[PDB]
Design a protein around this ligand. Structure first.
Ligand SMILES: *[C@@H]1O[C@H](CO)[C@@H](O[C@@H]2O[C@H](CO)[C@@H](O)[C@H](O)[C@H]2NC(C)=O)[C@H](O)[C@H]1NC(C)=O
Ligand SMILES: *[C@@H]1O[C@H](CO)[C@@H](O)[C@H](O)[C@H]1NC(C)=O
Ligand SMILES: *[C@@H]1O[C@H](CO)[C@@H](O)[C@H](O)[C@H]1NC(C)=O
Ligand SMILES: *[C@@H]1O[C@H](CO)[C@@H](O)[C@H](O)[C@H]1NC(C)=O
Ligand SMILES: *[C@@H]1O[C@H](CO)[C@@H](O)[C@H](O)[C@H]1NC(C)=O
Ligand SMILES: *[C@@H]1O[C@H](CO)[C@@H](O)[C@H](O)[C@H]1NC(C)=O
Ligand SMILES: *[C@@H]1O[C@H](CO)[C@@H](O)[C@H](O)[C@H]1NC(C)=O
Ligand SMILES: *[C@@H]1O[C@H](CO)[C@@H](O)[C@H](O)[C@H]1NC(C)=O
Lengths: 81, 167, 107, 45, 125, 167, 125, 107, 167, 125, 107
């Protein structure tokens, strides 16, 4: 009759960096770095942003005839250019 | 099957557990109390690293003309200073916390080993590989009492002494 | 081993009301709790794990909180499907006993 | 959080997609990998 | 999402072997524990016993420790309950469920998410 | 009682101490050496966190008009950056130090317990509540020698052995 | 503010029991140890013993340990010293005082901030 | 038993002068001493605890310094009230031995 | 000599070593496994503090005219805050790291002590200063095997037992 | 920098004491270890053993441990090797060399920089 | 015992050409290796200690890299004074076996 002391291991090959060590293989880890992007401009604070197509700030506010249709927006979070 | 030899893969119920061998049965088990303390602790630590951070509505991108070169240089300098301080602080912090996590886990293993050794001081022969081989023969209630922490010396003292005398 | 109690035993409320159900434990169970709702004659489903988090696939109207010997579950808007009974479970030790159960009914 | 390359979630405290951010955004870093261990050492039996 | 199907005899005499077989589709016996839950008519739930992995970890209720034995076989992909010396108090709706929920790589103990639809069984003459 | 059971409130002399039970008298005591060493350390640790902070005459509030909107945005951004880095680093620093100080206190308690066990050796039986019970009859001189660390083992080994034979 | 008052016989022949009572006004026997200090004429200060909490802690000077006994008597708010086999070399001026310096929740040992007026005790035939 | 030596035995100073009084320890005590002054026929009061901190109710002319075996107390400006005997005490172990004393005279 | 009483000038080869005392010769020796691991590792800590530090081409010197005072104050606030955060963070980081490094060393000493004690569980007594006097007689081969870690208990168990019987 | 000069007979018949010395100039036997390296012709270099500190610090080659003997004398500032039962296989070019490379205050084991000019000895009848 | 192998046994290359010489050890020696070149009839000299650091008094054309079982030494620009045999050494265990050696010839 034997009693053994052990710890859990699995198939996960996540690598964590430890001061005094490198590339330590561990059973689980969490990522604090978000390197992913949606890749699409989206509402900020739930406000659709102003869209400038082939136009600048000066052409939008001075009333360029090619930029006339973009003035009708009332509110915006930011401006794309 | 010891902790110095390696880590078990069959059990997934807890991080920390015991393996029992008996005539009646043989299987793994897990220490819910020790694991529950540790899971809570790690959860609190991760939450504190992510939560204590509170962002505000800031605008990073700035535009300056050719005349305002000093302003552009100042903005570049302050942005570079912020990102350098954040990189250094984050990297050193995460390295130190990883080392604390591994050290705390090792300390939990050693604490569990010393607890079961203090409970089985001389009733069971110590292999040295992380295995406590009982001199005295006892069934599953004996081993779960070892898990319970209610193991008693005088109940199996004479049989254990006789088994020492045999070996 | 860890005795489980529930309060109130029976409660009645209308649609859209706010109901708090307080299951209570004999000894501290830290933050570990499971909340199950059981439709009559159907399989119970998970609602709250760890007393503070939401399992995916459950509507976000349900909310749970508490620590120590006392815990609460708060529902913001109570619809028709939420009128089934509820259960409280501890998960720290064997035996993993369950709550007696609290029944919800219209008015 | 919003960057010119794309939208970034605001749950995690650090990001490295783009230095220029608008709104409530995680702090920009140059680190390639930022992972914290929540388990033990993984060794085969 | 795993699908759970359980098969039961539906009727049992006093004092013999009572065996039910629960089958799972879309899942395997890997990194998830499996347990049995029964409720008496009009009473609360209670936990009989749980198996985890493939026969590695066996947990039993202290009151029913001698009575229930859990057996698994991954090749046929079912887990079954074996009960001896059945009594009238054992009349219950047997549920088999998966310990599917996990935090930080551990499977939380006895927190169940997806169950079976239930197999009724009564002990009578 | 015991340290695993709780902490005594009777002893005000020092953070760590002894409770001796004897026929002639029983009372609380304190190990001044260990408590004193600890105080100087935390005094340095608390002093270091407070003192290292250095300051120079500084004006934080700055005023700009409508024509300087970019500047006021820059000033707001840089002030938000300083206060954010300051609060985050400080909150993490207090949390890490608080864990260390509490662990240092316990590590000290564990180090103290072993010193008594080593000096006593097998002459006593460990009740497991953190209390050592003497097989041999021990007067006030041998308790204070246990405090002194000058307890001598072969003097009372025969009486302890005879009491082991009786029990 | 704590004020210490001490009463004594003022004369005791050699080998006669010596009893001293010191009462405290404005303070209690809680979370503050209490010590005894004596000095012979033209010499330095000596420390006899200390009673802390409410009789919880009793520390005596090792040299005088055999002849000194210290009682707390919290109920009457007076701590007392009992002496036996007093000789002519034990003539001194007896001081009762309180150890109150506290840093970080713990009291500083034997560093006395508030002192009594003092009582003279001489040994003669 | 630790040994306390106080030097000089006596010294004479006038009003407004600066004097440094020293107590010496045979065994090294880190930063833990007590300094008391005693009027003739009166109880001693507490001046400096921990050899670097000032007791409340004591004027700021009193300063303590030193580490290891040698410690000093420095008077910024002598005043008539400070002419009485001074005593140095160690506080690390029993028996807590007390200093021999040094008298200051008016010159 | 005991490690508590003093250090050893003689072991120039490695930080950790076993002083060897035998009849045919008396001298010093070094335990290389532990020392090599520590030296390579301490290098990582020193490298981490100096390598993570990244620098870029910056010009902190800015020149402002008398009518641009508001901007100048901003530059003084920015670089004063930068140097203050850098000083406090660095001074605290160096202090915390130094304490851990000394402790890491103490933990290694205690681990080697427990390792040689688990190797030599009861064949030699413990004086408490950090040395093991053999009951049995061990030559250079078996004592080197103790250094090797391949020492075998049952060969010298009978001699140790009879030496216990003699004393 | 230290210059190492070694003196050897250069010729030896089989089976007696073979002794060679090595003198050091510009250095002392303080905190720097010392070693002997031998190289048979047509074969590689071989480490026979080393001496470090003022004295002791002895660990030798386990293959050749019994026959060799190393010692130092601080007054003459020399270190010598003692070899017995010499065979024809021991014919080698003997190098006396010092490792002075240290990182973090500790000498690097068995990594040697400053070497002697060479001491060749032939084993023949 | 640590087994030592160097490949190739013999290599020849012209001057001014980059060349990588590889020494390999069966056991794990971590990062502690060493490199010696030996002129014919002269004592060897140290090139690289710790497999990544350059010895003072040695030119910078020599560079060492690798970890674990395999290790490489690389010459940036080969000159006439580098025509020598090369040795590889383990420093973690006794005997500290040296390498077989690799020859270098004019080509
Ligand atoms: C905005 O500019 C883009 C880029 O030139 C225009 O896209 C081109 O439009 C012309 C006219 O129909 C086409 O012939 C080209 O093939 C388009 N090129 C691409 C890459 O799409 C776009 O039409 C402009 N939009 C407006 C409203 O002026
Ligand atoms: C891990 O790999 C083994 C290999 O046989 C496999 O049996 C097991 O199911 C795997 N576990 C997981 C969680 O992937
Ligand atoms: C760590 O492992 C990754 C993946 O194998 C590799 O790209 C990286 O170079 C490794 N780092 C070190 C320092 O070896
Ligand atoms: C386990 O321990 C608890 C508390 O010590 C006790 O109440 C219980 O009876 C024990 N169980 C067994 C089977 O001994
Ligand atoms: C992150 O944001 C994107 C925006 O499109 C969204 O699709 C995604 O689900 C979000 N992820 C998280 C983790 O919230
Ligand atoms: C206490 O220990 C010290 C130093 O070991 C010694 O000088 C002293 O005599 C001891 N006290 C007693 C009462 O033995
Ligand atoms: C020392 O330990 C090693 C471990 O691999 C073993 O091979 C060797 O035989 C041992 N040698 C001695 C001196 O016992
Ligand atoms: C250390 O200093 C002492 C005294 O000056 C001297 O004898 C000894 O040789 C020195 N040791 C070293 C390694 O410098």
């Amino acid at each position: 009759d034997t009693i053994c002391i052990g710890y859990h291991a699995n198939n996960s090959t996540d690598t964590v960096d430890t001061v005094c060590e490198k590339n330590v293989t561990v059973t689980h880890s969490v990522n604090l770095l978000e390197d992913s992007h949606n890749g699409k401009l989206c509402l900020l604070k739930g406000i659709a942003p102003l869209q400038l197509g082939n136009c600048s700030v000066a052409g939008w506010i001075l009333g360029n005839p090619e930029c006339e249709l973009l003035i009708s927006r009332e509110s915006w979070s930011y401006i794309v250019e | 099957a010891g902790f110095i030899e390696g880590g078990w893969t069959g059990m997934v119920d807890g991080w920390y557990g015991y393996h029992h061998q008996n005539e009646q049965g043989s299987g793994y088990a897990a220490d819910q109390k020790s694991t529950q303390n540790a899971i809570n602790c790690i959860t609190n630590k991760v939450n504190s690293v992510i939560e204590k951070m509170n962002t505000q509505f800031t605008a990073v991108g700035k535009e300056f003309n050719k005349l305002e070169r000093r302003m552009e240089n100042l903005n570049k300098k302050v942005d570079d200073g912020f990102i350098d301080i954040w990189t250094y602080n984050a990297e050193l912090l995460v390295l130190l916390e990883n080392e604390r996590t591994l050290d705390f886990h090792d300390s939990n293993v050693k604490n569990l080993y010393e607890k079961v050794k203090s409970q089985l001081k001389n009733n069971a022969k110590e292999i040295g590989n992380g295995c406590f081989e009982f001199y005295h023969k006892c069934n599953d209630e004996c081993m779960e009492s070892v898990k319970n922490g209610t193991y008693d010396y005088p109940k199996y003292s004479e049989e254990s002494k006789l088994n020492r005398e045999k070996i | 081993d860890i005795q489980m109690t529930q309060s109130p035993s029976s409660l009645s409320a209308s649609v859209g009301d706010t109901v708090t159900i307080t299951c209570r434990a004999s000894q501290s169970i830290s933050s570990w709790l499971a909340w199950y709702q059981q439709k009559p004659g159907k399989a119970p489903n998970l609602l709250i794990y760890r007393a503070s988090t939401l399992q995916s696939g459950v509507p976000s109207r349900f909310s749970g909180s508490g620590s120590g010997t006392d815990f609460t579950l708060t529902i913001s808007s109570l619809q028709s499907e939420d009128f089934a009974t509820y259960f409280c479970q501890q998960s720290t030790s064997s035996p993993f006993t369950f709550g007696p159960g609290t029944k919800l009914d219209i008015k | 959080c919003q960057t010119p390359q794309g939208a970034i979630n605001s749950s995690l405290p650090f990001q490295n997609v783009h230095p220029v951010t608008i709104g409530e955004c995680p702090k920009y870093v140059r680190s390639a990998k930022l992972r914290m261990v929540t388990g033990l050492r993984n060794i085969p039996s | 999402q795993v699908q759970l199907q359980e098969s039961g005899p539906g009727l049992v005499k006093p004092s013999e072997i009572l065996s039910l077989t629960c089958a799972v589709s879309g899942g395997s016996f890997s990194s998830y524990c499996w347990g049995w839950i029964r409720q008496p008519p009009g009473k609360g739930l209670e936990w009989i016993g749980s198996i985890c992995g493939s026969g590695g970890s066996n947990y039993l209720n202290p009151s029913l420790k001698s009575r229930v034995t859990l057996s698994v076989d991954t090749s046929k992909n079912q887990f079954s309950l074996i009960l001896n010396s059945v009594t009238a108090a054992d009349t219950a709706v047997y549920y088999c469920a998966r310990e599917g929920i996990t935090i930080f790589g551990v499977v939380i103990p006895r927190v169940l998410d997806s169950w079976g639809q239930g197999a009724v069984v009564t002990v009578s003459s």
